[PDB]
Amino acid sequence: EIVLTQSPATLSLSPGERATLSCRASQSISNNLHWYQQKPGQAPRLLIYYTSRSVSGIPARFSGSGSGTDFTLTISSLEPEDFAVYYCGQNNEWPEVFGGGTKVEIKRTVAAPSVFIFPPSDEQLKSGTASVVCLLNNFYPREAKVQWKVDNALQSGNSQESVTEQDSKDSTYSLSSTLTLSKADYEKHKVYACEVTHQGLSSPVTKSFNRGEC
Amino acid sequence: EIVLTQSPATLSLSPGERATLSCRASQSISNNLHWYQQKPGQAPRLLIYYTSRSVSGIPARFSGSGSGTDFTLTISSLEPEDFAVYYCGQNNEWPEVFGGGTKVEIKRTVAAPSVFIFPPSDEQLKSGTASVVCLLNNFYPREAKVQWKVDNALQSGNSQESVTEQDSKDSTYSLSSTLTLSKADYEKHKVYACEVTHQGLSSPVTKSFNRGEC
Amino acid sequence: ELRCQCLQTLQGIHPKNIQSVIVKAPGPHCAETEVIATLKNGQKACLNPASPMVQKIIEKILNK
Amino acid sequence: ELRCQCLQTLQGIHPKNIQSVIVKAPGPHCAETEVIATLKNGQKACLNPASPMVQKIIEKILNK
Amino acid sequence: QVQLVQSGAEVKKPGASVKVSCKASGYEFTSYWIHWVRQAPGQGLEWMGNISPNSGSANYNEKFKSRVTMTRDTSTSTVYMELSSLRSEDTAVYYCAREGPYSYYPSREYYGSDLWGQGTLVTVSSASTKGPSVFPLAPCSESTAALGCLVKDYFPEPVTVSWNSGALTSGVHTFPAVLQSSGLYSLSSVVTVPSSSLGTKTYTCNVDHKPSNTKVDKRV
Amino acid sequence: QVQLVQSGAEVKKPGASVKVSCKASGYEFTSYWIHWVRQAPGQGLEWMGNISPNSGSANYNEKFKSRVTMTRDTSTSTVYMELSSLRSEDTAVYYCAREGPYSYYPSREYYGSDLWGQGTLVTVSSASTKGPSVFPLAPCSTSESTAALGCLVKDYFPEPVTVSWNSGALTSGVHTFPAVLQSSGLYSLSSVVTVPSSSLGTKTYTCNVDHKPSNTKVDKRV
Ligand SMILES: [Mg+2]
């Protein structure tokens, strides 16, 4: 089976700049290499076929080159609608194989997150569970670290996080982290805190609340 | 059909020297190119096959190489028995095709010919024809010019020449030039002469006879 | 070779124009038998393996 | 092909091992029909086109 | 005009079977291969196999050949993929896609997959269909404040969220769902607003969970 | 012995046919293709065609296919080439040569032609077999220390002629020239020898001419 390796995994560029995406095959696939674009909640869209051939309705700024083992997709000048994920796919042989994808994101200045903490609601507590939420709003780059602390004890394995897609207007990311505890466990402690580490910050930022003082 | 072109047509070298023979194909014959040696009165002999592969019982001094449609036979150090004709032959496709051959000749110092003239015999004259023979004996290089003159009138179109193979002992050539006349045309003239030009001579040598003296 | 080459086939072609025929059995990259004829002009055509005329064209070449 | 590839042939082989068969008609560089089988291991073998078992192997692939 | 229309989302228990359809319209059905390609949440593309609309013979990825069947119905220009012995790892969006046109003249130069279906989400889990509980996200007690709603313990995906019936869009961030250890999903939706607006303007998150026919309006 | 033995020389008129044989010995006959290659006097090599010793099917050069047939006899391991509608341009030495070994496993890597027959001369001409006239070559009348003598071997057909001097006792300084094909369609050659001028009138010099095609033997005292 063929393995397709794409590079880089993330490309950070500004609109108007040239984008160069790489696809390398483990063995020759002749010129039967195709490029696809994928946006959130949509099926992949074919951009270029048979290494360099044009596809109906695709803008002229997309072009492809390469042969056998090494392939390139070029976007001559990025438009805002081009910031998406790109996959290469081979069909020289079956099974078809796709690369792991390259995410093309907008490069902007570093922006520290604004941090907010939310205690569990009275309604949820009555039901036996306490969810504590920490929000990291409008930051860049995407990399951020959240550490939950309950009466200075570091929490691990009892939280889940999610990150939004890059905002179209300000090129930032936001992240939510949820700490889940039982009502009995939650009632046994006082200080609930979320410590945030990001490139935009000189040192970690902590937002906290004292249980019952809400 | 493939065309095989060999170069040079003649190679003049001394024993002990390296010989480099070229064969070029009009289009790809892959590596299915073979080399043969041919001596007078003998069938060709296979030396190297499939561009570079050794043939049982062939001396180490013969080797073959190639790149694309270009092939080479090398004789690392010529032995006296290596002076012969060499052909390349392809069998990647049918019809098989052979090159035009390269003749490897012995280079030796310049040697002037000794020249002799022979009148027609009484026996041949009785039969109605007169053949006059001029002999150029043991000369080097092969190039020689023989001009027939009958009563100082230059002859053209009524003579033929033959040349021997290079001599086994002294590496020279010998040449015969025969002038053919009818008995009636021969009896109408007195002075029969052959004039020889060769690199070994400072100026042309003339051998002659008068009919009234034979 | 590396996948199925024949999405569609012909019922039959002119047998006198055929230079060669490849008969491919089902394999790891194609689950059906494929028949590809190469014509004397170098054109390639997919043929129906189940067609009686295709089987008769092969027989005439095999006995030529 | 640019010349005959089959100086000698097999009267048949194991039909279960055959991946594909090329049946080449006589042409300008080969005056006889040539049958070359490619086995599942990638080995190639020349088959006798006139052999009844060879014709029956092709038929079994064509009907598979 | 050309389209590939797939059947609706499916929810299955491990060990069960699923059959997804892909109806083709507006083009010559017999001119294109139809492939099945899946994408697990947040992952890449994986080829399941394909089918010839002409012969009806399918080709499978060896990973699935023992538990997958692909068929075609000429009368309705519909192709099907049946995946059996389902496991949680089969949770993915399954797409059908066409590749062509190809005729009886073979070539070794291929087209890419130029037309794709809208996808069918197939969720494989021991969980049963359940609507969410919606909790407010509000500060314990400075010109900007954040508010939101925690959409907890629903199954399967998806959930959609708006604020003030779509009138409030600026500064809203609706996060991707997380799959909890319980096998139920949870997501949060937040909005940043002027702190002076708290106590004057109302903020309500509108949650729609079509799989369980649940609609919730949560004032925060 | 490992060999290819061909049939003897042939002489034909234009329009006639010739059949040359090539008997193989000492190796597995079915393992090698047998080719026919010709060489016109003083020219290069030209492929006529070949034959499979197994199937007996031949492959021809398109230049000759309409007037050439190649066959094989399994029982005697002999291959034949029959060339019809002969023309003067077919005058050549015809060789058979083997290429192999090959089996049922095809390859695109070939061997060269490693074993060749001794060749068969086929002469095609409107001329008829004729023995030569042998004339002496002697000076008109000698201050030099070396003199030349010889014999002019004229108007014979077909090739070859052999010449010796004093029944092979005189070899040093002899030059027997290659024959020339005259405008007449007959061949001619001279054979010469250089000797000490003092030996003329004491030592005898006789040329011995053998023309096997016409069963002619001539001794000429010079
Ligand atoms: Mg723009």
- Dist. CA A19 → ligand 1 center (Å): 15
- Dist. CA A80 → ligand 1 center (Å): 7
Other CB atoms within 10 Å distance of the CB of residue A49:
26
CB contact E42 to A (< 8 Å): no
Helices C52-62 & D52-62 angle (0-180, nearest 10):
150
Scan for tokens 């002489």, then name that residue: F11
**What are the structure tokens assigned to C62, written together?**
């095999």
Centroid of chain to Cα C28: 19
Residue type, B154: L
Contacting residues of C for A92, CB less than 8 Å apart: 2-3
Distance from CA of D64 to the nearest CA of B (A): 36
Method underlying the structure:
X-ray
> Which of B52, B86, B104 is at the close of a domain?
B104
Touching chains, E (3+ CB pairs < 8 A): A, C
CA neighbours closer than 13 Å in the CB half-sphere of residue B45: 16
Strands A102-106 and A114-118: unpaired
Query: In whole angstroms, what is the distance from residue C46 CA to residue C10 CA?
Result: 6
Find the closest chain C residue to A28 by CA distance.
C2
Which residues constitute the domain of residue D49?
A: 1-64
For residues E65 and E91, membership in a common domain is answered with: yes
Q: Three-class SS of residue F89?
A: helix
Instruction: Mark whether A and B touch (3+ CB pairs within 8 Å).
Output: no
Residue type, E187: L
Query: In whole angstroms, what is the distance from residue E147 CA to residue E137 CA?
Result: 6
Query: In whole angstroms, what is the distance from residue A177 CA to residue A136 CA?
Result: 8
Q: Three-class SS of residue E5?
A: strand
For residues A15 and A56, membership in a common domain is answered with: yes
For residues E158 and E115, membership in a common domain is answered with: no
Answer yes or no: do B46 and F194 touch at CB < 8 A.
no
> Which of B104, B131, B163 is at the close of a domain?
B104
How many angstroms separate the first and last alpha carbons of chain D?
28
Query: In whole angstroms, what is the distance from residue A190 CA to residue A89 CA?
Result: 54
For E118-147, letters b (16+ CB in 10 Å) and e give ebbbbbbbebeebbbbbbbbbbeeeeebbb
Distance from CA of C48 to the nearest CA of A (A): 22
Find the closest chain D residue to B96 by CA distance.
D3
CB contact D2 to B (< 8 Å): yes
Other CB atoms within 10 Å distance of the CB of residue D42:
7
Which residues constitute the domain of residue A9?
A: 4-104
Supply the DSSP symbol for B155.
P
For residues E183 and E119, membership in a common domain is answered with: no
Find the closest chain C residue to A95 by CA distance.
C29
Closest of F8, F91, F96 to residue F43, by C-alpha: F91
- Give the number of domains in chain C: 1
For residues E11 and E120, membership in a common domain is answered with: yes
> Which of A59, A78, A104 is at the close of a domain?
A104
Strand order in the sheet with E160-163: E160-163, E204-209, E214-219
Q: Does residue A174 fall inside a structural domain? A: yes
Query: In whole angstroms, what is the distance from residue A124 CA to residue A131 CA?
Result: 8
Closest of B12, B31, B6 to residue B87, by C-alpha: B6
Of D7, D31, D32, the CB nearest to F102: D7
> Which of E99, E124, E149 is at the close of a domain?
E124
Find the closest chain B residue to F145 by CA distance.
B114
- Give the number of domains in chain A: 2
For residues F25 and F120, membership in a common domain is answered with: yes
Q: Does residue A109 fall inside a structural domain? A: no
CB B98, CB F112: distance < 8 Å: no
Give me the resolution in angstroms, 1 decimal: 1.8
CB contact A64 to E (< 8 Å): no
For D1-40, letters b (16+ CB in 10 Å) and e give bbbbbbbbbbebbebeebbbbbbbbbbeebbbbbbbbbee
CATH, residue B137 = 2.60.40.10
Other CB atoms within 10 Å distance of the CB of residue F172:
9
For residues A8 and A99, membership in a common domain is answered with: yes
Contacting residues of A for E190, CB less than 8 Å apart: 135, 137, 174, 176
For residues F137 and F120, membership in a common domain is answered with: no
Find the closest chain A residue to E48 by CA distance.
A95
For residues B85 and B136, membership in a common domain is answered with: no
Query: In whole angstroms, what is the distance from residue E121 CA to residue E154 CA?
Result: 16
Answer yes or no: do B100 and F44 touch at CB < 8 A.
yes
For residues E138 and E175, membership in a common domain is answered with: yes
Instruction: Mark whether E and F touch (3+ CB pairs within 8 Å).
Output: no
For residues F116 and F148, membership in a common domain is answered with: no
Query: In whole angstroms, what is the distance from residue F58 CA to residue A126 CA?
Result: 98
For residues B146 and B85, membership in a common domain is answered with: no
For residues F78 and F144, membership in a common domain is answered with: no
Question: Which residues on neighbouring strands pair with residue E78, listed in sequence order?
Answer: E23, E73
Which residues constitute the domain of residue F137?
A: 133-218
Task: List the beta strands (DSSP E) in A84-199.
Answer: 85-90, 97-98, 102-106, 114-118, 129-139, 145-150, 153-154, 159-163, 173-182, 191-197
**What are the structure tokens assigned to B49, written together?**
């096959």
Query: In whole angstroms, what is the distance from residue A120 CA to residue A126 CA?
Result: 10
- Dist. CA B132 → ligand 1 center (Å): 99
For residues B138 and B179, membership in a common domain is answered with: yes
Distance from CA of A92 to the nearest CA of C (A): 7
CB F49, CB F55: distance < 8 Å: no
Q: Does residue B109 fall inside a structural domain? A: no
Of C23, C55, C64, the CB nearest to D25: C64
For residues B137 and B174, membership in a common domain is answered with: yes
Q: Does residue B33 fall inside a structural domain? A: yes
- Dist. CA A75 → ligand 1 center (Å): 13
**What are the structure tokens assigned to A139, written together?**
């930051």
Q: Does residue A11 fall inside a structural domain? A: yes
Question: Which residues on neighbouring strands pair with residue C20, listed in sequence order?
Answer: C38, D24
> Which of E90, E124, E158 is at the close of a domain?
E124
For residues B52 and B94, membership in a common domain is answered with: yes
For residues E45 and E114, membership in a common domain is answered with: yes
Residue B175 parent element (H or E): strand B173-182
- Dist. CA E116 → ligand 1 center (Å): 27
Q: After which residues is chain F broken (C to N over 2.5 A)?
A: 141
Q: Three-class SS of residue C34?
A: strand
Query: In whole angstroms, what is the distance from residue B167 CA to residue B106 CA?
Result: 10
Query: In whole angstroms, what is the distance from residue F48 CA to residue A125 CA?
Result: 101
Scan for tokens 């389902």, then name that residue: E86
> Which of E70, E91, E124 is at the close of a domain?
E124
CATH, residue E35 = 2.60.40.10
